[PDB]
Amino acid sequence: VDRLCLFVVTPVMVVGTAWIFLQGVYNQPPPQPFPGDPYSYNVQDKRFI
Amino acid sequence: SLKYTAKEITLSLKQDAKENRTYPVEWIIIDPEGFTENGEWEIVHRPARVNVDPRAPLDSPSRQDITFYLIIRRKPLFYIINILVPCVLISFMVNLVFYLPADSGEKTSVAISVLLAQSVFLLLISKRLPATSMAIPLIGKFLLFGMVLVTMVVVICVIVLNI
Amino acid sequence: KNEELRLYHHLFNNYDPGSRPVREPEDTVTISLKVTLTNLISLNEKEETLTTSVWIGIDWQDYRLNYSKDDFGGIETLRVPSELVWLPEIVLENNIDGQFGVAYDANVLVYEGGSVTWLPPAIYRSVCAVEVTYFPFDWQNCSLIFRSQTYNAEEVEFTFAVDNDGKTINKIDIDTEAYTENGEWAIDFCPGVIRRHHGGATDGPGETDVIYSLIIRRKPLFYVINIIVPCVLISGLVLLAYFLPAQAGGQKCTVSINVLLAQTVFLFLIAQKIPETSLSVPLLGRFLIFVMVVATLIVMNCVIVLNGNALDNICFWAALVLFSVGSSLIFLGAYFNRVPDLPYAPCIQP
Amino acid sequence: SEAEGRLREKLFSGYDSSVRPAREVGDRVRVSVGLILAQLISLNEKDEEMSTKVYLDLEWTDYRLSWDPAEHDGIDSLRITAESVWLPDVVLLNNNDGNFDVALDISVVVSSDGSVRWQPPGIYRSSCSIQVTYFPFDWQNCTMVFSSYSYDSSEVSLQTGLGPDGQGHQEIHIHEGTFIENGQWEIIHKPSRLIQPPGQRQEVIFYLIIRRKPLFYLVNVIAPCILITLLAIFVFYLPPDAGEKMGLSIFALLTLTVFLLLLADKVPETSLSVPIIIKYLMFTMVLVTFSVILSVVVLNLWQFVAMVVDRLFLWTFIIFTSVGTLVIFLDATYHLPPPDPFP
Amino acid sequence: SEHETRLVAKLFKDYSSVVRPVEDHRQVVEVTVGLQLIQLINVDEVNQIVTTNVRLKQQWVDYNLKWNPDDYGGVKKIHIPSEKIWRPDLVLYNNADGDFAIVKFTKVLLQYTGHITWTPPAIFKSYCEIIVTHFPFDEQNCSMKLGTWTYDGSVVAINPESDQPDLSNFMESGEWVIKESRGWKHSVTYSCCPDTPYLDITYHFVMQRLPLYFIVNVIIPCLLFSFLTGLVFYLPTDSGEKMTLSISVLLSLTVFLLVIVELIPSTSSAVPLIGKYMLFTMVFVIASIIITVIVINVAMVMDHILLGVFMLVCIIGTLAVF
Amino acid sequence: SEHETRLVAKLFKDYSSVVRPVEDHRQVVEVTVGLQLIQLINVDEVNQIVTTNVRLKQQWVDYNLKWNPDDYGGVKKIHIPSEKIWRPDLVLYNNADGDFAIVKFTKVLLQYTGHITWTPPAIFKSYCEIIVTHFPFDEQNCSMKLGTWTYDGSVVAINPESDQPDLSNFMESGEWVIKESRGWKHSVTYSCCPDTPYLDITYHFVMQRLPLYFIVNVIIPCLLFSFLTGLVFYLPTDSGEKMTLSISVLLSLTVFLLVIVELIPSTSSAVPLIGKYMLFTMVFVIASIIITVIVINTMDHILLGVFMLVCIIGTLAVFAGRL
Numbered sequence A: 001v002d003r004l005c006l007f008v009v010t011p012v013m014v015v016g017t018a019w020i021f022l023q024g025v026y027n028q029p030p031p032q033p034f035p036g037d038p039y040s041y042n043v044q045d046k047r048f049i
Numbered sequence B: 001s002l003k004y005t006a007k008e009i010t011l012s013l014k015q016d017a018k019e020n021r022t023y024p025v026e027w028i029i030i031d032p033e034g035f036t037e038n039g040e041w042e043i044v045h046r047p048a049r050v051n052v053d054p055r056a057p058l059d060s061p062s063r064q065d066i067t068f069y070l071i072i073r074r075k076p077l078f079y080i081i082n083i084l085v086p087c088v089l090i091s092f093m094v095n096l097v098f099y100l101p102a103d104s105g106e107k108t109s110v111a112i113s114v115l116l117a118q119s120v121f122l123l124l125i126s127k128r129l130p131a132t133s134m135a136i137p138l139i140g141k142f143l144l145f146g147m148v149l150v151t152m153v154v155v156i157c158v159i160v161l162n163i
Numbered sequence C: 001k002n003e004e005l006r007l008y009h010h011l012f013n014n015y016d017p018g019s020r021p022v023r024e025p026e027d028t029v030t031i032s033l034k035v036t037l038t039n040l041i042s043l044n045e046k047e048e049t050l051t052t053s054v055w056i057g058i059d060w061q062d063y064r065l066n067y068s069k070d071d072f073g074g075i076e077t078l079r080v081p082s083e084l085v086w087l088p089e090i091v092l093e094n095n096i097d098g099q100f101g102v103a104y105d106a107n108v109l110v111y112e113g114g115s116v117t118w119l120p121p122a123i124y125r126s127v128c129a130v131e132v133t134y135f136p137f138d139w140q141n142c143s144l145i146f147r148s149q150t151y152n153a154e155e156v157e158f159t160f161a162v163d164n165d166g167k168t169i170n171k172i173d174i175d176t177e178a179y180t181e182n183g184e185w186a187i188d189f190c191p192g193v194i195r196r197h198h199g200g201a202t203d204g205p206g207e208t209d210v211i212y213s214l215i216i217r218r219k220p221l222f223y224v225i226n227i228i229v230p231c232v233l234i235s236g237l238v239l240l241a242y243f244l245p246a247q248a249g250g251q252k253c254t255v256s257i258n259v260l261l262a263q264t265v266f267l268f269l270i271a272q273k274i275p276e277t278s279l280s281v282p283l284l285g286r287f288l289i290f291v292m293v294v295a296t297l298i299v300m301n302c303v304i305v306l307n308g309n310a311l312d313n314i315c316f317w318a319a320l321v322l323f324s325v326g327s328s329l330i331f332l333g334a335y336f337n338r339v340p341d342l343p344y345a346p347c348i349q350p
Numbered sequence D: 001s002e003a004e005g006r007l008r009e010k011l012f013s014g015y016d017s018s019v020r021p022a023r024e025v026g027d028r029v030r031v032s033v034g035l036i037l038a039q040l041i042s043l044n045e046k047d048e049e050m051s052t053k054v055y056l057d058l059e060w061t062d063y064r065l066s067w068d069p070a071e072h073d074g075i076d077s078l079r080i081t082a083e084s085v086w087l088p089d090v091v092l093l094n095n096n097d098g099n100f101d102v103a104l105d106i107s108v109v110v111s112s113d114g115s116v117r118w119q120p121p122g123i124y125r126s127s128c129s130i131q132v133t134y135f136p137f138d139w140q141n142c143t144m145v146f147s148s149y150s151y152d153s154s155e156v157s158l159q160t161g162l163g164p165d166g167q168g169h170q171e172i173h174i175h176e177g178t179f180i181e182n183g184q185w186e187i188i189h190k191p192s193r194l195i196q197p198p199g200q201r202q203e204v205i206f207y208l209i210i211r212r213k214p215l216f217y218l219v220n221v222i223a224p225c226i227l228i229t230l231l232a233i234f235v236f237y238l239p240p241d242a243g244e245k246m247g248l249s250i251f252a253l254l255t256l257t258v259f260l261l262l263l264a265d266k267v268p269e270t271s272l273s274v275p276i277i278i279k280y281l282m283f284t285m286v287l288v289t290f291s292v293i294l295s296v297v298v299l300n301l302w303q304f305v306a307m308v309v310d311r312l313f314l315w316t317f318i319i320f321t322s323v324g325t326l327v328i329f330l331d332a333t334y335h336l337p338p339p340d341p342f343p
Numbered sequence E: 001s002e003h004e005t006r007l008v009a010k011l012f013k014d015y016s017s018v019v020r021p022v023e024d025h026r027q028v029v030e031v032t033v034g035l036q037l038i039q040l041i042n043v044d045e046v047n048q049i050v051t052t053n054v055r056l057k058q059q060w061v062d063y064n065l066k067w068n069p070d071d072y073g074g075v076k077k078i079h080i081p082s083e084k085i086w087r088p089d090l091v092l093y094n095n096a097d098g099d100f101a102i103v104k105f106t107k108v109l110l111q112y113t114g115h116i117t118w119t120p121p122a123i124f125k126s127y128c129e130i131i132v133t134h135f136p137f138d139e140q141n142c143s144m145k146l147g148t149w150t151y152d153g154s155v156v157a158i159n160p161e162s163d164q165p166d167l168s169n170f171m172e173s174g175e176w177v178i179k180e181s182r183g184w185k186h187s188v189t190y191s192c193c194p195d196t197p198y199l200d201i202t203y204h205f206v207m208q209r210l211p212l213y214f215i216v217n218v219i220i221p222c223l224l225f226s227f228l229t230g231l232v233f234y235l236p237t238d239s240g241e242k243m244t245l246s247i248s249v250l251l252s253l254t255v256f257l258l259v260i261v262e263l264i265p266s267t268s269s270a271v272p273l274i275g276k277y278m279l280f281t282m283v284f285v286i287a288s289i290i291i292t293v294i295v296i297n298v299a300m301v302m303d304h305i306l307l308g309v310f311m312l313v314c315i316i317g318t319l320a321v322f
Numbered sequence F: 001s002e003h004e005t006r007l008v009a010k011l012f013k014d015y016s017s018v019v020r021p022v023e024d025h026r027q028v029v030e031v032t033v034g035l036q037l038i039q040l041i042n043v044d045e046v047n048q049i050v051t052t053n054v055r056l057k058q059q060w061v062d063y064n065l066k067w068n069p070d071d072y073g074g075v076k077k078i079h080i081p082s083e084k085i086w087r088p089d090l091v092l093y094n095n096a097d098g099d100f101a102i103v104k105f106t107k108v109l110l111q112y113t114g115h116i117t118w119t120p121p122a123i124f125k126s127y128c129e130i131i132v133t134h135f136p137f138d139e140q141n142c143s144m145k146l147g148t149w150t151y152d153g154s155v156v157a158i159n160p161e162s163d164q165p166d167l168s169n170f171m172e173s174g175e176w177v178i179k180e181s182r183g184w185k186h187s188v189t190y191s192c193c194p195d196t197p198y199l200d201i202t203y204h205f206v207m208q209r210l211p212l213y214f215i216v217n218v219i220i221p222c223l224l225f226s227f228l229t230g231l232v233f234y235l236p237t238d239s240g241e242k243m244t245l246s247i248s249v250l251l252s253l254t255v256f257l258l259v260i261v262e263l264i265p266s267t268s269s270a271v272p273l274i275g276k277y278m279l280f281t282m283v284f285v286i287a288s289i290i291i292t293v294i295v296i297n298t299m300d301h302i303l304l305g306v307f308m309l310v311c312i313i314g315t316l317a318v319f320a321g322r323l
Ligand SMILES: *[C@@H]1O[C@H](CO)[C@@H](O[C@@H]2O[C@H](CO)[C@@H](O[C@@H]3O[C@H](CO[C@H]4O[C@H](CO)[C@@H](O)[C@H](O[C@H]5O[C@H](CO)[C@@H](O)[C@H](O)[C@@H]5O)[C@@H]4O)[C@@H](O)[C@H](O[C@H]4O[C@H](CO)[C@@H](O)[C@H](O)[C@@H]4O[C@@H]4O[C@H](CO)[C@@H](O)[C@H](O)[C@H]4NC(C)=O)[C@@H]3O)[C@H](O)[C@H]2NC(C)=O)[C@H](O)[C@H]1NC(C)=O
Pocket: A030, A032, A033, A034, A035, A036, A037, B049, B051, B052, B053, B054, B067, B069, B071, D177
């Protein structure tokens, strides 16, 4: 029973931990400040009048 | 402005000139002489917008505003070293319970100690974060999952000892 | 018509509170100072702030406010807002929260003959270095430094108030109708000294300030009950692990480690109650550290023995002797740390 | 802007902001009080205090500030610093920190007919009786009482602010397009009521019925307690020969006690009622103490009898705990906030 | 509002707020002082400070502020800024860390007879000698000594509005119940000013704590641990867990003593009954551990006797304490 | 008996506190700035804020506030409110949560030569980058950038009174010792104002922490718990205390790590050395527990020797680094 519980819980624990940590690490801010607006609002992208 | 409205004052972004051509300064100004790098937050974007609400009355104060945005990203290395690593190690320590012999009489003790450590970490993180119900923090979800797994492992160990 | 209005108009129609009450610029204004302590609000060792409530009796002669009762229908005292008269601008120099002045701008009392009296109440938080060496049986030499924020010693000069018997009150005054005893800190002495110094290295204008030395004493009884006794019991319980069997089932190491954890919790409590200053270590903290070291050595000895009964007994006797000697030596310094005998009169009259 | 300066000087020539604009000696001043909630900053159970950021909407008629725009270059409205006109001293009576007045005296808007409108921002910390019972599924009914501090009901008559169409929209105004949503509390009902005097004063009471979002406390508090209770129940399944039953029981009891001590700081210190979660925690602690006592008795007791007593205690404690927890949870969940703000 | 504007302009044209509002300097300004208690904000036993929300209804006649109503269309009362007029300088003698005097200068109700009623709000953080002996079932007698600071009894006389504080608007606190309240006038003489006694009004309130919160969150767990303390003497030595239980109970008692120390002032005036019970329980735990160690180093009969003795002593101590 | 009132009336009859106190507008106001540090009130590492009690002595000659002493009976100095005169608008650039400018407007001392000395008190809550690496034996270099906010260097020039801050009245702090102090004047160009460089005086203080309190309350328990780890390998398996002792050591180390992380700011610029040591000890304890479980299921002496040698080497390296 101990070995069965190991073989059941250990991979589940590892998969859950890895999933949580990968979902956390992969989070990044969007490349644009406002979604749906192509303008970057950056000093190098001066929008001359 | 609260003393004035769009009928009284028109807000606009600062215009700056390069090569005799003017352009609006649509971002937060950072001056390298006056700017101090914060130790936790990196400024990824810093836009500025003049917001006008078309449905708001022209004489209401809420019609216009200038909003400067700071999209700041947390530097996680401190939290990885000090929080994430001990919590993950303590969670994975529960997997060793299945390996300790039943004659040792310490499997339940190990499981309960792991549960207590997880509870202490959850208390610390819940103290470090606001009580917002919008979403469970990722580390909080991991802690809850680990606590559930530790409870199940304690039940399994108790059953094994009974057998 | 009210005679007080005539007196006020007569005194203040041509009065300038900016200039000092001196006929010549080189004259000094003599100030009579009498700090009356109402209660010692608290002594925060962690923040090193002494909070006290005082009444600052300040008396001086202002020839511009001189009047006789015979000319104004027998008025002997006039209450005037303090913003209207010249003030010596006495401030607590060694404060810590930035509140130099008094808490309430009470009216000044202009008596006949030109004597002006001000008795404002003030709550003061001041820097008092805390000597935690002999805690909880410690006594603290807090000090209050009063000086003019504006004028030097050649413009404003301090003197102590004189009692009805002619004796100078060269100490903090305590009034039985106002003083409320603090339940944690007793007050032993409160002498006052008017210090004078030179200014710049080129013999600049003199400086003068009044320093009151509140020599106060901690009432240790509470800390005896709730801190000392638990720590002593915990340290005593350390020695019991040796009588536990040196075979399977003997929880000697477990007991030792649990007592060490309890002593660590007590150390955390002491560190919370005692400031982070590193000038000295509290003798109770030193005793706690010594007991923790002894407990670690006892754990080591138990591990060695388990890896026996005679060795357990001999280590029990050795550890008991060492612990007793250490506890006695630690507590002797605290017990001997009485307030020293000093020439000052007691602050609270028997 | 010559005409504006001339009109302002005309209006304030001989004006006195300390005198209320009663025309006749018996005339009352009617002040419409509306409230716009910009942010529900927080609710503190320990202090029983709700902190909110609001914009008032005070409207009254000051006959002294009326003018004909046709004589003054068509100026039909004017913005004037609030300190220069008479203001009703509307204050938050039930504030908890002594800050009666508004946070910033922004300018009022005066219409040519003498209608003065003022929308000052205020940061307010009102006292709010916390419903401690149904934590964390509890709903709170906080009140903001606005009244003139000095003037009697015979001098200033308060009224609830009407809707933009003139409807009796006796509600706290919330612009859903800009309102700063609170992360823990959801506003359900937001009515307002004018309260008549029982020299007495009228009051305008604004009601915030905010429901606690329980997910945070479900995850961080309730679930650990349930797990600890389950472990304390399963303690009775550990055989005596393992020698770990007393350890597990003591650790479970200590963890439950620590959770109780932590929750005691979350719940208010008032003792008018016991939170249902606190009652559950106390029942669980009593159960764990009885379990420890029965384990000690079983150890003192022979082995077959001890095992039979252990199993009997296990079944009885399981039944009692399940029944108590189910009843408590049903009672806590059933008491939803009412659909009517005045039941 | 023209009548009231003219009246206000004429009253304060040459008004002086410095001198007292008497016709003759030999007269005494008689001020009626009524303390209204709106809310008992906080009681801090640790700092020995009581924070209360109050209104100070002060009423007095100003000789110069009379007017004839028929001159002003029948205006019989007006509201004026209180900074304009002379006011008694009521100071809270026992201020701990707040303001001594009033700081919210709300409007004054002035009537044509000259009668001024001023009801400023205040938050008073008064010093109170917290008696911790019977905590949490204790009752606290807390007072507020209010009086004119610079004016003595021969110059300004203050009289209580009623023998009891006005509790009509009192927001009933959920932790403390006011058993009784009363206001006493006193005429004490200070060493500063021996020729002239100074009058004060000392309001006092006998508050009583509602112990349910402290019973549930403090007393019950400590009682449970004290009950479990004696249980160790029934567990046989062969279990090998008597010391683990005794030390876990000791640790729990240490934690709760730490909590209680944070809940009570560190003043050495008297030991709390709960503090005394906790110290007794700690001594009993130490003695029980010593005796258990001696027994480990006949055993069943001693265990039974010690279990009975511990249970009886626990019940006796609980009865004598509660 | 009235000459000082006459003098004060004559000086300020048509005085303007808006214009600079120079005879010609093309001249530069020379201000001498001396920071006197009265007390180092606090150094909050977690908030990275240093709170200091200072007297900010400023000395300058006001061209219009001269008088002839013989006109006023030999009066050579007067005290006047600072709100009446023109003042340099010294702002603390690195303010964290305090006031930018002086708010305690004490009286200034004016002399017949026009020399004004103003010594306002201030409680500066300045920003300081707290270095956590060598904690609790760290030396912190905290600075105060003080300068005229609106007046540029060609208009109002500030000069330091002395190369070092005035520590003559410094109340010795019980936690930090000022090992060094120095003031440097700088001119820098900001993007707001490209044609006019602005002057500032950056005072800096190299303060060394006194570690004794942290040694007693933190370092010693951590060292004791680390030492207790190695005993598990000498303790026999038949005792049954191996696992309980290892779990207790792990829990104590976790609690001490939480205490340390609470005592240290969450800035991610650099890792602390004590925190790194605690993490290494945690990893070592985890490995030791794993190996103990392997042994129990199934070495003890070899692991004990290896752990003792490695621990002694690490302790010697840590002691050398902290010294
Ligand atoms: C950080 O936080 C800040 C805020 O704190 C974030 O800033 C917000 O960013 C969002 C995302 O872009 C913005 O939302 C968009 O706003 C624009 C602008 O519209 C405004 O101005 C218009 C006139 O200029 C006016 O018509 C708009 O009114 C609309 O919205 C109001 C409010 O709901 C309604 O009452 C009106 O009836 C009307 O709908 C408004 O004042 C909008 O264009 C944009 O709308 C698009 O997206 C919506 C949902 O995504 C759809 O419902 C809309 O139909 C519309 O759809 C879009 O239409 C485009 C035109 O054809 C098309 O190109 C596009 O593909 C299409 N998109 C989709 C998905 O169908 C939307 O509402 C918000 O205003 C910002 N807030 C500010 C600036 O204060 C910021 O993003 C954050 N940064 C991060 C996360 O990195």
